[PDB]
């Protein structure tokens, strides 16, 4: 049975490099194209390129041409993908996948038939450093807006834990700066509302 086993998760800073391995078993490694596909969180699949493990021949998608190198070691049936000069948006799950049978006489490198996949290798790219959040105030609707913090998580409460009904704390958004932002929301009233926020050793209170 065909198995594609990838290396473990990677943590990197911008400008650095990452090299992901894909060890193949259960078939003849040099007989099939190996493709690389990546997927940023919540985003779509994105083809990166292929390699001929028998010859070492590659192609790469235009978008990664100049930054990516695909190599192979046939003695241990292992393919490699190295991505250089990493940026925050290179953060993704990287998959190796077996493509078409390698023929002379036909170019089957472009066949989108990926019958077997690696389990995927997460690499997270971040240049951001620890920063405390700023906290701002927003049937009646109320809430507070907390800008530019790092990292996850934060715990937010209202009136030091007294209120829960109709209370909604939104998931953080990750900005192109490497920083997070969220909002927590819960007129009739004759009321003090404080949103109590915990992180950076951060404890703030805000109406």
């Amino acid at each position: 049975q065909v198995q594609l086993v990838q290396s473990g998760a990677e943590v990197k800073k911008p400008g650095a490099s990452v090299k992901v391995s894909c060890k193949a078993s259960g078939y003849t490694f040099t007989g099939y194209y190996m493709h690389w596909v990546r997927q940023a969180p919540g985003q779509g699949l994105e083809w990166m390129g292929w390699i001929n493990p028998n010859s070492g021949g590659t192609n790469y998608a235009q978008k990664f041409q100049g930054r990516v190198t695909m190599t192979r070691d046939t003695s241990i049936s292992t393919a490699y993908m190295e991505l250089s000069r990493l940026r925050s948006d290179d953060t993704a799950v990287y998959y190796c996948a077996r493509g078409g049978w390698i023929s002379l006489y036909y170019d089957s490198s472009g066949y989108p038939n990926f019958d077997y996949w690696g389990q995927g290798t997460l690499v997270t790219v971040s240049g951001a450093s620890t920063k405390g959040p700023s906290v701002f105030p927003l049937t009646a609707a109320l809430g507070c807006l907390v800008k530019d913090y790092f990292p996850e998580p934060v715990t937010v409460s209202w009136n030091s834990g007294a209120l829960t009904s109709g209370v909604h704390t939104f998931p953080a958004v990750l900005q192109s700066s490497g920083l997070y932002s969220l909002s927590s929301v819960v007129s009739s009233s004759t009321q003090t509302y404080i949103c109590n926020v915990n992180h950076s050793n951060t404890k703030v209170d805000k109406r």
Binding site: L45, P112, N113, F114, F136, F170, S181
Partner: protein
């Protein structure tokens, strides 16, 4: 390197037939019968469901079929089940030994009637950040458009992926970071229907 065009979301009731479209150009989808469909459940690798437009790998249920007309390929799922709920990607040969994926389609199998989105738009000590808060919507897919007065703005926008609330509905948020603030509108469209908030 322009992705194939798929619907962002598709929904159906159990037992129904659903169809997901994949629109490319005459130079890929429409020049070849090299179109594949992939099913992806969260946290797992994609899985080949259909290849060469209409062929099924062994093991794949016969409820999944594929067809192609012109530059548009289509995945059809009959007798919908709860487990068929996933993300679906079309993929085609793109010419010149390259491969291109479609943008992806979220298939939702309705376990509750489609509802809302409720939109709260905040124009907010800081005087600039406009905040569009989106909640209680089902299925879990929305797209967000920002307007300065009556003219679009697409720069400086950060939006979350939809996240599941306890009531199997979804929540999301879109941020507009500005300087120019001195009306604004947040436009969220859900299942082809637009919900608008103005400040």
């Amino acid at each position: 390197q322009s992705a194939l065009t798929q619907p962002a979301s598709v929904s159906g009731s159990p037992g129904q037939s659903i169809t997901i479209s994949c629109t490319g150009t005459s130079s890929d989808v429409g020049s070849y019968n090299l179109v594949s469909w992939y099913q992806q459940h969260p946290g797992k690798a994609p899985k080949l469901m259909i290849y060469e437009v209409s062929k099924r790998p062994s093991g794949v249920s016969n409820r999944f079929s594929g067809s192609k007309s012109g530059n548009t390929a289509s995945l059809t799922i009959s007798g919908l089940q709860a487990e068929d709920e996933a993300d679906y990607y079309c993929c085609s040969y793109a010419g010149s030994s390259t491969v291109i994926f479609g943008g992806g389609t979220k298939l939702t199998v309705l376990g509750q009637p489609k509802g809302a989105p409720s939109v709260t738009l905040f124009p907010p000590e800081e005087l600039a950040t406009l905040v569009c808060l989106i909640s209680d919507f089902y299925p879990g897919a929305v797209t967000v458009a920002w307007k300065a007065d009556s003219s679009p703005v697409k720069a400086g926008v950060e939006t979350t992926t939809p996240s599941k609330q306890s009531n199997n509905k979804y929540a999301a948020s879109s941020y507009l970071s500005l300087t120019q603030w001195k009306s604004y509108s947040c436009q969220v469209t859900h299942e082809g229907s637009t919900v608008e908030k103005t400040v």
